[PDB]
Scaffold this active site. Structure first.
Site, mmCIF file in Angstrom:
data_model
loop_
_atom_site.group_PDB
_atom_site.id
_atom_site.type_symbol
_atom_site.label_atom_id
_atom_site.label_comp_id
_atom_site.label_asym_id
_atom_site.label_seq_id
_atom_site.Cartn_x
_atom_site.Cartn_y
_atom_site.Cartn_z
ATOM 1 N N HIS A 1 19.591 107.549 -5.427
ATOM 2 C CA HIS A 1 20.350 108.696 -4.964
ATOM 3 C C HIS A 1 21.581 108.944 -5.842
ATOM 4 O O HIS A 1 22.101 110.067 -5.849
ATOM 5 C CB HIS A 1 20.688 108.571 -3.477
ATOM 6 C CG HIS A 1 21.916 107.788 -3.132
ATOM 7 N ND1 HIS A 1 21.875 106.550 -2.503
ATOM 8 C CD2 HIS A 1 23.215 108.099 -3.278
ATOM 9 C CE1 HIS A 1 23.117 106.146 -2.286
ATOM 10 N NE2 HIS A 1 23.947 107.076 -2.719
ATOM 11 N N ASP B 1 15.199 103.915 -2.214
ATOM 12 C CA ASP B 1 16.467 104.265 -2.833
ATOM 13 C C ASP B 1 16.901 103.138 -3.765
ATOM 14 O O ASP B 1 17.761 102.335 -3.416
ATOM 15 C CB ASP B 1 17.530 104.551 -1.771
ATOM 16 C CG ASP B 1 18.768 105.162 -2.372
ATOM 17 O OD1 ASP B 1 18.735 105.457 -3.602
ATOM 18 O OD2 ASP B 1 19.735 105.317 -1.624
ATOM 19 N N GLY C 1 24.475 101.740 -4.516
ATOM 20 C CA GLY C 1 23.877 101.143 -5.697
ATOM 21 C C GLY C 1 24.338 99.703 -5.928
ATOM 22 O O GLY C 1 23.699 98.948 -6.659
HETATM 23 N N1 7R8 Z 1 27.905 103.166 6.329
HETATM 24 C C1 7R8 Z 1 27.478 102.910 5.132
HETATM 25 N N2 7R8 Z 1 27.218 101.625 4.882
HETATM 26 C C2 7R8 Z 1 27.317 103.923 4.037
HETATM 27 C C3 7R8 Z 1 26.597 103.613 2.846
HETATM 28 C C4 7R8 Z 1 26.510 104.518 1.823
HETATM 29 C C5 7R8 Z 1 27.101 105.808 1.925
HETATM 30 C C6 7R8 Z 1 26.997 106.779 0.893
HETATM 31 C C7 7R8 Z 1 27.618 107.994 1.010
HETATM 32 O O1 7R8 Z 1 27.541 108.919 0.007
HETATM 33 C C8 7R8 Z 1 28.338 108.320 2.184
HETATM 34 C C9 7R8 Z 1 28.446 107.401 3.189
HETATM 35 C C10 7R8 Z 1 27.837 106.126 3.095
HETATM 36 C C11 7R8 Z 1 27.916 105.160 4.132
#
Ligand code: 7R8
Ligand SMILES: *[C@@H]1O[C@H](CO)[C@@H](O[C@@H]2O[C@H](CO)[C@@H](O)[C@H](O)[C@H]2NC(C)=O)[C@H](O)[C@H]1NC(C)=O
Lengths: 241, 105
Positions: free
Chosen positions: A41, A90, A187
């Site tokens: 992503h 992903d 990532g």
């Molecule tokens: N709550 C998570 N662990 C989490 C993980 C990745 C994320 C990637 C984004 O772009 C926005 C929020 C996010 C929240």
């Protein structure tokens, strides 16, 4: 990283910062001198082409990560079955054009083997420069936090992720929230120590807000992709298979 | 036609198309060259860290053993089903030094 603390140098030597246009976009994990595991992503269009990306290893502070101090990426391979709608599969690999020189602050994490036999609530660590609060800005310093695996059945509860968690995903964090990964951590590593080795269990993929209750972190289930990673690393520079 | 490392002790396994399953490889007649070939097959190019025999802990009754008279065929084709390893050990193979931090002692 929400609810973490800043990392010391060499604590997470595999952690890299992936920059486009001289700014952090996402994290990654070093696996060989040339290969980094990241999220698909992060490298969606219009950032699918390698020339956008530089990697920064062995540096905790974003302001020290300036043009030239970093490593040009040569390839970007999204998992073939990556689905942006569901975030399934992903995971992506970046190949550097120049190999990293491993030292006390830059080293690889081990790919997960089959038969790791982790506990259902295995103690893991997340690291990155993502927001330290929901919708916050990139952190200047590298943070890290302990998180626990959350069994996928528990995570697919209608009070959590309503059957959205696939076999290519694993959940980690706390259902009570408060400690989580966040935007910018994507990532980057979810690691666990076992048999005195640090293993790459997950790559930060998605979640609903950050550190909210009943909304833990979802990570790429890296062990599902180890063989694909092998094949990509082998296919690189190969005439016939 | 494939290879993997199994579990936290990195047991080299090879998949059998017939038996439709994965089997460890005996330490019998194995050496670093065979390990390097296995690492290259897993995409690790010129990386090699270590290989040694370890006592199988999985109660396995099906192994892959080196036919040292196979001649100059690929290593996959040198290997045959065997219900025991004469060395009493299976191959443990790490293709890269990984998974250690500044603490890790
Ligand atoms: N709550 C998570 N662990 C989490 C993980 C990745 C994320 C990637 C984004 O772009 C926005 C929020 C996010 C929240
Ligand atoms: C290891 O390889 C050798 C040679 O490739 C095998 O011996 C051959 O066996 C076939 C079938 O019985 C004969 O037709 C050949 O003439 C043999 N050549 C020899 C003796 O070199 C040997 O049997 C193999 N060992 C195992 C256990 O697979």
């Amino acid at each position: 990283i929400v609810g973490g603390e800043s990392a010391l140098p060499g604590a997470w030597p595999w952690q890299v910062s992936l920059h486009v246009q001289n700014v952090h976009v996402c994290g990654g994990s070093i696996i060989t001198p040339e290969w980094i595991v990241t999220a698909a992503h992060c490298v969606e269009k219009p950032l699918n082409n390698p020339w956008h990306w530089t990697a920064f290893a062995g540096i905790l502070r974003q302001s020290f990560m300036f043009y030239g101090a970093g490593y040009q990426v040569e390839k970007v391979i999204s998992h073939p079955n990556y689905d942006s709608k569901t975030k399934n599969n992903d995971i992506a690999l970046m190949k550097l054009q120049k190999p990293l020189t491993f030292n006390d602050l830059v080293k690889p994490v081990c790919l997960p083997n089959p038969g790791m036999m982790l506990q259902p609530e295995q103690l893991c660590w997340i690291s990155g420069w993502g927001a330290t609060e929901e919708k916050g800005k990139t952190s200047e310093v590298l943070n890290a936090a302990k998180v626990l695996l959350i069994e996928t059945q528990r995570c697919n509860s209608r009070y959590v992720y309503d059957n959205l968690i696939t076999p290519a995903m694993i959940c980690a964090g706390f259902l009570q929230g408060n400690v989580d990964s966040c935007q910018g951590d994507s990532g980057g590593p979810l690691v666990t120590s076992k048999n005195n080795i640090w293993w790459l269990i997950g790559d930060t993929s998605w979640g609903s807000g950050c550190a909210k209750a009943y909304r833990p972190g979802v990570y790429g289930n890296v062990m599902v992709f180890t063989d694909w990673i092998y094949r990509q690393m082998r296919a690189d520079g190969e005439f016939v298979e | 036609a494939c290879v993997r490392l199994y579990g936290p002790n990195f047991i080299l396994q090879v998949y059998s198309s017939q038996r439709k399953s994965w089997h460890p490889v005996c330490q019998d007649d194995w050496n670093e060259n065979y390990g390097r070939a296995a690492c290259r097959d897993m995409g690790y190019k010129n990386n090699f860290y270590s290989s040694q025999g370890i006592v199988d802990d999985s109660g396995s009754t099906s192994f892959m053993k080196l036919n040292t008279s196979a001649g100059n065929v690929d290593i996959y084709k040198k290997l045959y089903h065997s219900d025991a390893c004469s060395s009493k050990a299976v191959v443990s193979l790490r293709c890269i030094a990984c998974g250690v931090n500044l603490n890790s002692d």
